[PDB]
């Protein structure tokens, strides 16, 4: 115990000598002293405190001199000492600033208590004459820094001779406040007829000299004590016969204006809960008379008539203020009290207080009346809403110079008087706000207009627009008159809260629906009625006014230190939050307003003829145009992110997202660049980058994962960066600066010795968190929030290194950090049994749980990773050959040699290829029944990607529409609810299915490209290369064979990786498994071609695959068996396959027909190698040879060009056909010679022309010599009809390009010579 006294004395001596880094020291030491006092009274409450420590503590207090916080810290200690001790009791009684001593004496007398009683009363009244101290302590100890306007002046009208504590900001502990209020509760209970009689007779005899007003101070002590504690305040309502209930019955008998004020303050504090409020309400009903509602309302009427000199006494005005405050408290707390008071005519609360408001009264009394009205309308029904709106109408329209004042002039007078003073302004605006809160609830369908529609029809008052105009005129013009900053912040908070309550209830879904595709569908009378009457039409107009914008950015821009050091619930923060929220909502609903609302209003006002002052700035064609002028807004938001207020930070981040994304602002700022230089004015761009960095490396709470302040701030930062980077990507933006890059005019670099160049910036913080996060927790595999987070970070990086400006730097820094190796290290591979937040995949039925998104996100993450790898490998391979390729390839094989002793094991790239398991069958989902609402349209909703919000609104309004007609309402309704839920359930499932398929395709493209780059860019030798390609085939084949029936997008990627793999081609086992896989591929390619699957490009890949499998693999018992089974496979499908290949030839696609031509050539060649051919017979039956010979006509037009190589393959096929007997026959049968004669066909360009002539001459020669003497006459006619040409060539034949041309001439000469001798043109002579 004494050691604690010594420590406290030392702390006080230190703080006193130090005043004669520093602020934080004073704060820490006073906190230590308060903790020590807390521990001291905790010990005294226990039986450890001895008899001498009591005397020592009372001696320290006797010596205490200054009224300081340190003294307040010891009040619980004294109370505990007196409670424990107060024979020992009698000795300590006798043993006992001066006001302290008096309070100590009074406390002991109350805790320990004919001659004795007389002495007690004597010395107790002596101490009292000298409560004021006890009250001053109770008030100062529990003093919130932000003032509550609803209770201004309450409990602050008693004379205080106590000196105000010094200005040092030492805030008491919440627990110390609770402890002191417990001790004051005990003091009240201990103390609980001479004082009342003495003081009231003293008032009447000499009222001019008010004195000894101690009983009121005692009641206020009770009020401060039981404040906030209804569980303890129940002692006044738990038992009627108790002494506390007796005290309440006694203090309320007589009505002395100051005592009545104190008693009503005491009730306001006691009645703090619904039960305590109901008990108080019942006490004042009385259903020796106590203070009842009857008396209160009687005096209200009496003073009402008094005001309308004739000005209420200060004490009476205070009395009325306490009455109205007690009314408001008991109305907000209790439903019974409010319902009884609002319309029990005997009380006539509303009418009487409205009359009193009209008359001349102080600002506070009028504000109290407004607050009473607000309390009466905090909860309401549409009937009470209409009633109160009728009474407000009569009170505003009607409560001399000429004959009479009009009604609109009356309303203007009411509005101009209000708003001049702060209290009237705040109370009236908050009442308006409360009135515009629908009784149903803020967030509901909200079909109706928040106020009665007829509020405008009478006396041409334009509905609610007057009230909105008043609130905005206060917010802009008449708030200039306010001086105290706290009042200004509270007023702006009230104004912006009014604006929000206005903008919320405006359902834009109803407006967009009605415009795209009325009377009863919505609760409102008509759509146009809802549009024009709703305050939204007017509110938006204001938000385009310059003064409103200036007042907003003035509300935002505040003192940063006073802002950060303030409380999150204080008006200083909440005001800025509401201002940001107003700006956000304006940017949101701006599109709806300018196009679907403003035209209707400007048309209805011209038709109806009515008009009102246009407040919107005609120059602002868009909300953005008003804020982009002064740039300082972005700086303020970024700085406020550093203040550690969750809600405010998120709001600032979303506002930055929208400010930077908008077309207007970006177009105006950057035609160097405004936003960047502005963030650089005083070096803010770096401190907010630092703050954001520390924010995205803050710890997380596993229990609170999705709803984690740090987690939500992270996602907000990432969403801001991604959204700012997506828009205007190829130019420097705010995000690029904040990441650490140096932004020159249309160029990005890194400033030496800065945060980025030293790996401290926001970008490196993203990398750090990305590489160190453990996505998969052990208990529940793959926690969704970490997956989503990784996706957000990876997509940011992806947009970063995709753009050309950032690409170079981002890729360099990622290589320097071994980013890839860490990612591959922490990337888990997918398995069917892997639970995602405790849910197996189990096919299509898994898409509905939010975990579905996680899966999708993870796929995207994978894709991003693979894309980087591909680029990395390629970018490493082309520029030079460093030793990094070795590391990349080892890591893709499951080995990292950064550590020399043991290379950690990673799933191989082929093991990572698990995302495609077609057993799920995502695509094919069932369609619901929809017996009811069979064809409910989904047009407004919208591959096909539905907008569920508009669908759900449709369902809600259709349920209301159906309800109104009244057809099987009580019973058949349950089935409608079920139908609705089934419908929205299926829509979400369909959306997520489509998104998953998109992610899967994108990931596959990435994976296929990765493997493709690997295949070409590698330094393998033959022995590892063969096994590497075997693994590739083992991975891709089961998919490409089983999935060929499903879809085509994936089949194209897998088919072309197979193509290239095959084309870039112990030892026996490998080569055999390879040939086995290659035959599997050949069979699946045949099966796909025979079914005319996919697009012509996928069929071109198939044809290329089949062509090489026939040219190289099959073309020695093993070879014979391979040829035999190959021909078996071809014959199995037979006519269909050949039919599709021939249809593909001479087709739309350029390369498909070429590949098909070359494939048919290889087919017939391998079938001959096995005297005729069945493939050639099939071709003859399918009329392929006929159309082919026909195409030989006009061949001059067709003939490096694609058409040239197509004709080359075409003529090569013709040649290979004319080689055999029946082939040449089928060719010749369809008027070949006539076709080539009609074509009129008879250094490198000459070489190509000679090659064409060679091909044609070879076709002719082969066809003639094949069948026999039936066509030798045709050969003789061909040589005689084109003679001279043959002579020219034979005479000619008898550097590189010249050698090629001469060889072609030699071949043409040989061809003509062969044709001549085989036909026997010598014999003809």
């Amino acid at each position: 115990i004494p050691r604690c006294m010594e420590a406290m004395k030392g702390v006080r001596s230190m703080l006193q000598c130090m005043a004669d880094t520093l602020d934080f020291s004073r704060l820490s030491l006073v906190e230590q002293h308060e903790c020590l006092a807390s521990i001291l009274h905790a010990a005294v409450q226990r039986h450890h405190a001895t008899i001498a420590d009591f005397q020592d503590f009372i001696k320290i207090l006797r010596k205490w001199d200054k009224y300081d916080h340190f003294l307040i810290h010891l009040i619980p200690v004294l109370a505990a000492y007196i409670t424990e001790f107060g024979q020992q009791a009698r000795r300590l009684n006798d043993f006992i600033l001066p006001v302290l001593g008096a309070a100590v004496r009074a406390w002991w007398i109350a805790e320990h208590n004919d001659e004795e009683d007389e002495q007690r009363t004597k010395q107790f009244l002596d101490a009292l004459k000298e409560f004021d101290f006890i009250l001053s302590v109770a008030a100062d100890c529990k003093a919130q820094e932000w003032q509550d306007p609803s209770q201004l002046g309450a409990r602050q009208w008693l004379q205080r001779k106590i000196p105000s504590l010094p200005s040092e900001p030492f805030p008491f502990s919440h627990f110390l406040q609770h402890s002191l209020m417990v001790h004051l509760e005990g003091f009240v209970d201990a103390t609980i007829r001479k004082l009342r009689t003495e003081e009231d007779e003293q008032r009447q005899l000499r009222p001019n000299h008010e004195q000894d007003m101690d009983l009121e101070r005692f009641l206020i002590i009770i009020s401060y004590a039981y404040e906030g504690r209804p569980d303890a305040a129940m002692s006044f309502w738990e038992d009627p016969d108790s002494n506390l209930a007796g005290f309440l019955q006694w203090a309320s008998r007589r009505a002395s204006t100051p005592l009545v004020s104190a008693f009503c303050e005491m009730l306001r504090c006691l009645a703090d809960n619904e039960e305590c409020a109901t008990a108080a309400h019942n006490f004042l009903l009385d259903e020796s008379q106590s203070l009842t509602w009857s008396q209160i309302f009687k005096e209200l009427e009496y003073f009402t008539t008094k005001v309308c000199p004739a000005e209420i006494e200060p004490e009476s005005a205070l009395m009325l203020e306490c009455y109205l405050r007690l009314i408001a408290k008991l109305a907000t707390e209790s439903e019974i009290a409010r319902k009884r008071l609002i319309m029990d005519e005997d009380f006539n609360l509303v009418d009487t207080i409205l009359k009193l408001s009209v008359g001349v009264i102080p600002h506070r009394l009028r504000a109290c009346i407004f607050y009473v009205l607000k309390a009466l309308m905090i909860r309401k029904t549409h009937e009470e809403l209409d009633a109160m709106w009728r009474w407000v109408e009569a009170w505003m329209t009607n409560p001399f110079l000429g004959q009479t004042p009009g009604p609109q002039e009356c309303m203007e007078m009411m509005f101009r008087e209000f708003g001049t003073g702060f209290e009237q302004s705040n109370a009236f605006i908050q009442l308006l706000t409360t009135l515009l809160v629908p009784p149903e609830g803020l967030n509901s369908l909200n079909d109706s207009v928040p106020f009665p529609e007829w509020l405008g029809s009478s006396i041409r008052t334009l509905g609610i627009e007057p009230y909105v105009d008043f609130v905005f005129d206060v917010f802009a013009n008449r708030t200039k008159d306010i001086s105290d900053p706290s009042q200004l912040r509270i007023l702006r908070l009230s104004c912006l809260d009014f604006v929000m309550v206005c903008l919320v209830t405006f359902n834009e879904d109803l407006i967009v629906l009605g415009h795209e595709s009325i009377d009863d569908a919505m609760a409102a009378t008509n759509l146009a009625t809802y549009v024009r009457l709703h305050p939204f039409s007017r509110v938006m107009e204001w938000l385009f006014n310059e003064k409103v914008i200036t007042s907003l950015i003035n509300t935002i821009h505040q003192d940063p230190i006073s802002l950060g050091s303030a409380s999150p619930d204080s008006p200083l923060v909440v005001s800025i939050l509401r201002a940001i929220q107003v700006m956000i909502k304006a940017l949101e609903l701006q599109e709806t307003y300018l196009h679907l609302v403003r035209p209707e209003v400007l048309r209805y006002q011209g038709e109806a003829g009515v008009r009102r002052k246009p407040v919107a700035n005609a120059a602002y064609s868009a909300f953005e145009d008003g804020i982009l002028s002064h740039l300082s807004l972005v700086v303020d938001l970024g700085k406020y992110c550093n203040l550690g207020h969750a809600e405010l930070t998120l709001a600032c981040l979303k506002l930055l997202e929208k400010i930077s994304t908008s077309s207007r602002i970006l177009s105006a700022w950057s035609p160097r660049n405004k936003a960047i230089v502005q963030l650089e004015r005083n070096g803010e761009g770096e401190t907010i980058s630092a703050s954001l960095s520390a924010s995205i490396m803050a710890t997380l709470d596993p229990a609170l994962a999705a709803s984690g302040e740090n987690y939500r701030v992270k996602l907000a930062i990432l969403d801001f960066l991604y959204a700012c980077l997506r828009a205007t990507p190829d130019q420097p933006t705010i995000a690029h600066q904040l990441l650490g890059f140096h932004c020159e005019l249309s160029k990005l670099g890194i400033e030496p010795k800065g945060p980025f160049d030293m790996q401290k910036s926001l970008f490196h913080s993203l990398l750090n968190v990305l590489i160190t996060l453990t996505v998969s927790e052990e208990e529940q595999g793959m926690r969704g929030y970490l997956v989503t987070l990784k996706y957000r970070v990876l997509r940011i990086l992806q947009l970063l290194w995709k753009s050309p400006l950032s690409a170079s730097l981002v890729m360099d820094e990622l290589r320097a950090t071994n980013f890839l190796f860490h990612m591959l290290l922490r990337e888990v591979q997918i398995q069917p049994q892997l639970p995602w937040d405790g849910q197996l995949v189990t096919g299509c039925e898994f898409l509905l749980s939010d975990a579905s998104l996680a899966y999708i996100d993870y796929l995207a993450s994978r894709a991003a990773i693979f894309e980087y790898i591909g680029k990395e490998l390629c970018s490493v391979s082309q520029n030079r050959i460093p030793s990094i390729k070795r590391q990349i390839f080892d890591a893709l094989n499951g080995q990292i040699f950064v550590d020399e002793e043991a290379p950690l094991t990673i799933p191989s790239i082929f093991d990572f290829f698990d995302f495609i398991n077609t057993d799920y069958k995502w695509e094919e989902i069932p369609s619901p029944h929809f017996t009811y609402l069979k064809d409910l349209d989904l047009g407004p909703c919208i591959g096909v990607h539905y907008d569920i919000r508009k669908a759900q609104e449709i369902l809600a309004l259709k349920r209301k529409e159906y309800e109104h007609s009244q057809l099987a309402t009580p019973e058949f309704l349950e089935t409608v609810e079920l139908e609705e839920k089934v419908l929205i359930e299926w829509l979400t499932v369909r959306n997520r299915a489509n998104l998953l398929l998109t992610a899967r395709l994108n990931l596959l493209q990435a994976w296929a490209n990765l493997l493709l780059v690997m295949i070409e860019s590698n330094d393998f030798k033959s022995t590892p290369k063969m096994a590497f390609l075997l693994q590739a085939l083992q991975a891709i084949l089961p998919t490409l064979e089983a999935f060929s029936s499903l879809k085509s997008d994936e089949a194209f990627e897998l088919a072309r990786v197979a193509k290239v793999l095959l084309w870039k081609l112990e030892q026996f086992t490998v080569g055999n498994l390879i040939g086995d896989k290659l035959f599997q591929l050949f069979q699946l390619c045949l099966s796909a071609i025979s079914q005319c699957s996919g697009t012509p490009e996928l069929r071109s890949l198939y044809y290329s695959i089949c062509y090489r499998y026939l040219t190289a693999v099959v073309d020695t018992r093993s070879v014979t068996n391979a040829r035999a089974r190959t021909l078996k496979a071809i014959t199995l499908y037979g006519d269909r396959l050949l039919n599709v290949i021939c249809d593909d030839a001479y087709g739309s696609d350029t390369t498909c027909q070429t590949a098909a031509m070359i494939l048919l050539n290889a087919l017939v060649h391998t079938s001959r190698a096995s005297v005729d051919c069945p493939i050639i017979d099939a071709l003859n039956r399918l009329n392929f040879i006929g159309v082919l010979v026909d195409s030989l006509k006009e061949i001059l037009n067709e003939w490096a060009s694609p058409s040239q190589q197509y004709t080359s393959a075409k003529l090569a096929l013709l040649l290979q056909l004319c080689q055999t007997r029946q082939g040449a026959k089928y060719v010749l049968q369809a008027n070949l010679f006539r076709a080539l004669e009609q074509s009129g066909v008879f250094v490198v360009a000459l070489e190509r022309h000679y090659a064409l002539l060679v091909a044609l001459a070879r076709v002719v020669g082969a066809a003639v010599t094949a069948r026999g003497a039936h066509n030798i006459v045709q050969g003789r006619k061909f040589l005689t009809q084109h003679r001279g040409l043959v002579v020219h060539v034979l005479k000619k034949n008898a550097i590189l390009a010249q050698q090629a041309l001469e060889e072609r001439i030699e071949e043409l000469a040989e061809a003509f010579m062969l044709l001549i001798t085989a036909t026997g043109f010598l014999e003809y002579e």
Binding site: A807, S808, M811, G870, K871, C874, S875, Q878, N879, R880, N1009, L1012, V1013, E1016, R1056, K1059, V1060, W1063, K1064, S1104, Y1107, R1108, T1111, T1151, T1154, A1155, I1158, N1161, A1162, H1165, Q1205, S1208, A1209, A1212, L1215, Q1216, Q1219, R1258, A1262, T1265, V1287, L1290, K1291, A1294, M1313, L1314, I1316, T1317, L1322
Partner: protein, 62 residues
């Protein structure tokens, strides 16, 4: 992306695809020419290699 030849991964592997297709075209042309050469080699080697060239060495102006 500073050494000559550096191109986008897209261009790099698309040029790969085009390269493989062109090699297929050339391979098919080559083998066709050779397979044909083998056909007439079979037909001519059986008899009259020099007589077939001589007869027209004479018929037309040598």
């Amino acid at each position: 992306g500073t050494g000559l030849g550096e191109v986008d991964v897209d261009t790099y592997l698309s040029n790969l695809q085009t390269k493989t297709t062109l090699s297929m075209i050339a391979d098919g042309l080559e083998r066709s020419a050779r397979d044909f050469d083998a056909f007439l080699e079979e037909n001519v080697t059986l008899e009259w290699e020099a007589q077939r060239k001589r007869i027209y060495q004479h018929f037309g102006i040598k």
